[PDB]
Design a protein around this ligand. Structure first.
Ligand SMILES: [Cl-]
Lengths: 216, 214
C-alpha cells in the first residue's frame, strides 16, 4: 500500500542544509537515505554556492543535527552527463535501513509508465503527500531554477518523470512512489523541479546502487 | 483570534485615489499600512494611466486626503516582481502601527493550506468580513478583470492563494486572515482580484519585509 512504503521513505528522509563551519546555515531541501551511510541528493542544492572548498553540509535526522565537510564526503554519479542527482556517502551519520530493494528495477519501468504516483516529501520540516497525474517519461527534460532570489538559469534532467500537480518551494528531494501494487508500489525516483503545473523527477533504479557495496 | 487580527488590519486600511493637484479625486481601491510610512498597494491601481506628468496619488486616512506626486514616490518590490503588489512610501501620511509580525512565516505556509480564511476589507468606508473556501495555493494565477470601467486587463499573480467566495468592485487591497489558531490566525496576503466565485490573493510573508527596514 502507498502508505506502507511511504512510511519507510519517511524514516529515511532528512533535511539538507549548506554553510560554513561555525557560521551561517541555509536549510535548502531534502535528501533521502538509502543504505548504511549513503544518501541521494539533488545537485542544485550545492552547485551554485560560491565556494565548494570551504562548504560544510548539514543534516537534520529527526531532531539531531550532524555535519560533515564537503571535502570528506564521497560522491557518486548515477549516470554520465549533467550532474542532476548524486549519491553521497556521509560517515558521521547514523546507519540507514536498507530500502534499496524497494526502488524500481530497470526492466519494470514500462509497468509504471502512464499511471498515478505520490510524492512523499517534507516542506521546511512538515510532511506532505502530493498527488501526481498519469506519469509520462522524457529522455531529457528542462526546467528553470532561481539562485537564492534573483537570477534564473536553465537546467536539464536526464530520464525524467512528468506529473501534473501544484508544487510548493522546498519540496525537492522527496521520493516518488507508484500506485501500482503489481510492482509493489515501487519508489520511482527523486523530485527535482516544479514549474507551470508540472512536477519533474529523476528516475532512479535498483541498478544505480551496485557500486555502493564495493570496497573502495 | 480572527477578530483580534481583523481589528489590526482595519486600523491600517486606507483608500487610494488618482487625480490632479487642483481637481477631483478618483478613488479606486484600498491600500494597507504595514509599518511607519510604508503601504502595500496593488499595482493595477495606477499602472494603466499614461500621463505621469500631472498625476497625484491620494490617500484618505481619517477623512483627510494626503497626496504625493507620481514623480516623488519610492516604490519597492516583495520578491522581484511589480506586476502584482508593491510597497510604497508616502512621507506625508500619518504613521501606521507595525503589523508585520502578524504576517505568516514562510516555513508555516503548509499549515494554512487546506483551511478556511477570512477577508477583511472595505467598500467605500463600509467594513466587510468574507469567508473564503479551503485555501489552495498556485505558482502563478491569471485573472482578466474588467477593473477599470469598460477596459479589460490581464492580472497575473505569483505565489497566490485561491479560494471560493463572493466579491464586489473595490474590495481590492484588503487582507486575508487564517482561521488556524495554532499559527495565531496569521495574515496570509493581499486581495488582488475577484469576480464570479473565485478570489485571488498574493502571498505575503514576514520575511518579505526585510527589504524595507534597511
Ligand atoms: Cl477564530
Amino acid at each position: 500500500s502507498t502508505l506502507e512504503i511511504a512510511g519507510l521513505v519517511r524514516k529515511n528522509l532528512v533535511q539538507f542544509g549548506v554553510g560554513e563551519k561555525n557560521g551561517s546555515v541555509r536549510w535548502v531541501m531534502n535528501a533521502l537515505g538509502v543504505k548504511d551511510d549513503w544518501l541521494l541528493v539533488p545537485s542544485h542544492a550545492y552547485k551554485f554556492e560560491k565556494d565548494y572548498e570551504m562548504m560544510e553540509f548539514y543534516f537534520n535526522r529527526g531532531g539531531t543535527y550532524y555535519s560533515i565537510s564537503a571535502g570528506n564526503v564521497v560522491i557518486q554519479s548515477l549516470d554520465v552527463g549533467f550532474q542532476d542527482v548524486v549519491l553521497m556517502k556521509v560517515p558521521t551519520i547514523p546507519k540507514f535501513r536498507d530500502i534499496t530493494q524497494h526502488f524500481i528495477k530497470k526492466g519494470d519501468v514500462p509497468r509504471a509508465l502512464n499511471r498515478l504516483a505520490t510524492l512523499v516529501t517534507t516542506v521546511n520540516g512538515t510532511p506532505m503527500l502530493i498527488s501526481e497525474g498519469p506519469l509520462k517519461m522524457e529522455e531529457k527534460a528542462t526546467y528553470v531554477h532561481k539562485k537564492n532570489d534573483g537570477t534564473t538559469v536553465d537546467l536539464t534532467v536526464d530520464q525524467a518523470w512528468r506529473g501534473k500537480g501544484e508544487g510548493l518551494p522546498g519540496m525537492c528531494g522527496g521520493a516518488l512512489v507508484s500506485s501500482n501494487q503489481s510492482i509493489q508500489n515501487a519508489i520511482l525516483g527523486i523530485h527535482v523541479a516544479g514549474g507551470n503545473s508540472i512536477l519533474v523527477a529523476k528516475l532512479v533504479t535498483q541498478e544505480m546502487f551496485q557500486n555502493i557495496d564495493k570496497k573502495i
